[PDB]
Amino acid sequence: SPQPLEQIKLSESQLSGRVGMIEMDLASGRTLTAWRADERFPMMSTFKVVLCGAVLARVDAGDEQLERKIHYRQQDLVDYSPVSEKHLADGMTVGELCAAAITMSDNSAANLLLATVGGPAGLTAFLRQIGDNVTRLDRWETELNEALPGDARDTTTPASMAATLRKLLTSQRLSARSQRQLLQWMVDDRVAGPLIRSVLPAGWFIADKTGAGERGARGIVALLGPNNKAERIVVIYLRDTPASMAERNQQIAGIGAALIEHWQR
Numbered sequence: 663s664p665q666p667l668e669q670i671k672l673s674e675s676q677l678s679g680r681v682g683m684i685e686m687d688l689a690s691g692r693t694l695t696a697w698r699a700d701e702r703f704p705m706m707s708t709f710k711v712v713l714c715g716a717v718l719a720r721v722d723a724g725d726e727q728l729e730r731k732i733h734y735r736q737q738d739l740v741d742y743s744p745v746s747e748k749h750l751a752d753g754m755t756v757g758e759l760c761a762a763a764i765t766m767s768d769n770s771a772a773n774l775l776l777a778t779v780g781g782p783a784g785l786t787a788f789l790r791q792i793g794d795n796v797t798r799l800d801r802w803e804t805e806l807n808e809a810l811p812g813d814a815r816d817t818t819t820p821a822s823m824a825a826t827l828r829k830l831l832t833s834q835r836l837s838a839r840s841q842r843q844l845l846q847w848m849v850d851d852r853v854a855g856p857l858i859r860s861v862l863p864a865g866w867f868i869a870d871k872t873g874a875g876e877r878g879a880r881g882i883v884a885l886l887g888p889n890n891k892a893e894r895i896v897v898i899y900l901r902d903t904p905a906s907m908a909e910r911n912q913q914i915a916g917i918g919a920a921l922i923e924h925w926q927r
C-alpha cells in the first residue's frame with residue numbers, strides 16, 4: 663500500500679470524487695492524518711452516533727431514561743425500518759431505539775429519537791453546547807441523505823466529526839456508564855462491523871457507524887487499533903462520485919489497508 667495520504671489521493675483520482683479524512687489518537691486528540699479535514703461532507707447515517715450522544719446527555723441530566731418505552735404508529739415510519747416496523751404494537755425503549763439506529767441504521771428509530779432531543783435544531787444546539795460549531799443537522803430521515811452538490815445542510819467536516827466523537831466518548835461530558843454505552847452501540851454495528859472484522863488482521867479492534875447517500879456519498883466513523891484496543895478515531899467521507907457502492911467500499915477499505923500497513927507514525 664502507499665502511505666495513507668498517497669492512498670487517499672489515489673482514491674480521489676479513481677473515484678473522481680472528493681474524499682475527506684481524519685486519523686486521530688482517541689486518548690489525546692492528536693491528529694495524525696488529515697485530508698480535506700475542514701471541508702463539508704454529508705453525514706448520512708453517521709449522524710446517528712451524535713444523535714445518541716445527545717440522548718445520553720439527557721439521560722445523565724435526569725431528563726430521559728433508556729428504559730422509557732416509546733409508542734409509535736405505522737404512519738410515523740419512513741423508508742428502512744427493519745427493527746421498528748416489528749414493534750408497532752409493543753413499542754421500543756429509548757435505548758432499544760438507539761441500538762436500532764446505530765447498529766441497524768433503522769431510520770424510523772432515528773426519527774423517533776430526533777423527536778426526543780428537539781429535532782434537527784435541537785441536535786444542532788447540542789453540538790454547539792459541546793463546542794462543535796460546524797456540524798449541522800437540518801432535516802429528518804430520509805431527506806437528510808440527499809447530498810445535493812454545494813448544500814451545507816446535514817453536513818459535518820472530518821475534523822469536527824472526529825473531535826465531537828472524541829468528546830462524546832472520552833471527555834466526561836457524558837457519564838462513565840453513558841460513554842461505555844455509546845461505545846458498545848458502535849462495537850455492535852451489524853451493518854458493517856462483521857464485514858470489516860472479516861478483512862481485518864487478527865488483533866485489530868473495530869467499532870463503527872457507516873452511512874450512504876445520493877451522488878456517491880459514503881462515510882464511516884470508526885475506532886480502530888492493534889492489540890485489541892480502540893487506539894484511533896478514523897473518519898472518512900466520500901462525496902460527488904459516480905462510482906458503484908462496491909467500489910466506494912473498496913476504496914475506503916484501501917485507505918484502511920494503508921493505515922494498518924503504515925500504523926506507527
Ligand SMILES: OC[C@H]1O[C@H](O[C@H]2[C@H](O)[C@@H](O)[C@H](OCCCCCCC3CCCCC3)O[C@@H]2CO)[C@H](O)[C@@H](O)[C@@H]1O
Binds near residue numbers: 917
Ligand atoms: O502487516 C499488517 C497486516 O497486513 C495484512 O493485512 C491486510 C488485510 O489482509 C487486508 O484485508 C486489509 O484490507 C483493509 C481492510 C480494512 C477494512 C475497513 C477499515 C475501516 C476501519 C477504519 C475506518 C475506515 C476503514 O489490509 C491489511 C493491511 O494490508 C496481512 O493480511 C496481515 O496478516 C498483517 O497483519
Ligand SMILES: *C(=O)/C(=C/N[C@@H](C(=O)O)C(C)(C)S(=O)O)CO
Binds near residue numbers: 767874
Ligand atoms: C444511512 O446512511 C442511511 C442511508 N440510506 C440511503 C442508502 O443509500 O442506503 C438511502 C437509500 C438514501 S435511504 O436513506 O434509505 C439510512 O438512512
